[PDB]
């Protein structure tokens, strides 16, 4: 992947998470489960929807009858007509094929970028209060209940609130 | 108190077998996709602009 998250340091996808494209798995004393980050998912769904509509709706054609009829003494203009139909066929086929090829690659990179930014948003929030244990997972140095978990997902994690407890537990763990 | 509790960042997957092509790779299975190529017709001659044809 272009950004390294999908099929990268996050190795696989979650069939268990069904309500969103990008989300979270959590586990605390209150239990575990999957949840989807609604903001990032809806932003990506809006973006891709706009992309598909842009590809479709920018093609606005008028009423037209492609066919033409020529008699046996009009072979040259008949071939001229064929060249026009063929040239348009070649232009549209090649352009359509490459547009799908190139934009499909951009779409998968887009998802890869969205995952990386989501991981980095959390990592920049938790800082040293949690450990980066790989596969997109953070292991906390302080207890993080459901309310604390939602604050991380909401982008409102209070680092100073838990920094002292995490610091003491981190030093004890490392010692 | 004790440390612990984990949070993980991940992405969706499903049982989809839809394959698309990309500039770098062919037959990449994806979770969702749409078709831009109409390849079906109703097999009938019909009325343009509401008006029937002359047969």
């Amino acid at each position: 992947g272009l950004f390294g998250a999908i099929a990268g340091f996050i190795e696989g996808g979650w069939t268990g998470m069904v309500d969103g494209w990008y989300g979270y798995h959590h586990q605390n004393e209150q239990g575990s489960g999957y949840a989807a980050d609604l903001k990032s998912t809806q932003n990506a769904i809006d973006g891709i929807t706009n992309k598909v509509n842009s590809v479709i709706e920018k093609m606005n054609t008028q009423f037209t009858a492609v066919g033409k009829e020529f008699n046996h003494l009009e072979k040259r203009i008949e071939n001229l007509n064929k060249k026009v139909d063929d040239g348009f066929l070649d232009i549209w086929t090649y352009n359509a094929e490459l547009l799908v090829l190139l934009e499909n690659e951009r779409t998968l990179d887009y998802h890869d970028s969205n995952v990386k930014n989501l991981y980095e948003k959390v990592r920049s929030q938790l800082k040293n209060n949690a450990k980066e244990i790989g596969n997109g997972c953070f292991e906390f140095y302080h207890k993080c209940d459901n309310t604390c978990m939602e604050s991380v997902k909401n982008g409102t994690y209070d680092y100073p609130k838990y920094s002292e407890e995490a610091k003491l537990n981190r030093e004890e763990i490392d010692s | 108190a004790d440390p612990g509790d984990t949070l993980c960042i991940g992405y969706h997957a499903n049982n989809s077998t839809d394959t698309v092509d990309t500039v770098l790779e062919k037959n990449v299975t994806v979770t969702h996709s749409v078709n831009l190529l109409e390849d079906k017709h109703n097999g009938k001659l019909c009325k343009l602009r509401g008006v029937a044809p002359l047969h």
Partner: antibody
Amino acid sequence: EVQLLESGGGLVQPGGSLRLSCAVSGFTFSKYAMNWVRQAPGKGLEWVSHISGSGISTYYADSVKGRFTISRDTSKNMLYLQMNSLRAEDTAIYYCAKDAISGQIWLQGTFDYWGQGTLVTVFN
Amino acid sequence: EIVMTQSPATLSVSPGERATLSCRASQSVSSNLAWYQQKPGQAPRLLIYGASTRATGIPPRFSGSGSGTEFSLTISSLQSEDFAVYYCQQYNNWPPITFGQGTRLEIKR
């Protein structure tokens, strides 16, 4: 082969303390999370405690919170269970269970290998 | 806590026959369900993980199925070694990890 050996069980009065040891051999200890599961005499199974491969995360059953403590020494291939404030209802056979998977938190909670267990009796 | 109910408590059927076990959950646990076997005097052994995948060394005669709240375990040809107690356990919302009360398979004579 993978071997899990329990020890440290025995008789004790209520309010006493015991410490279990799970001897680990046959796999990379650091890669896998460990658990304690107990079974009352002639009864069903009951999960007790869990510790992650790293050791930072621990989870406990509600009835043993504040009394039991799970720990590991990865360099020595050892898993421990320190029980304080023991109760008569804690009388059971205690097994240490290895998690069947490594590096997938969302797919943990499955025990592929169990030791034969050790017995803790707390009568009065 | 996800309560696990495992009926019938005791099931009677002859060797070589087929036995169906049921596991019910108070809440959906998706496919994060396991099955365990415990012969008398021995530690529990893992049979099924993911509610349908057999573990290493599990012979093909053991079948697992289900999702959500209703689950089942099937032994196609029942041999005398398999007359034991079977437990079901969820790992979809824990802690706590919860087991069912188990089912005893008795030989019919």
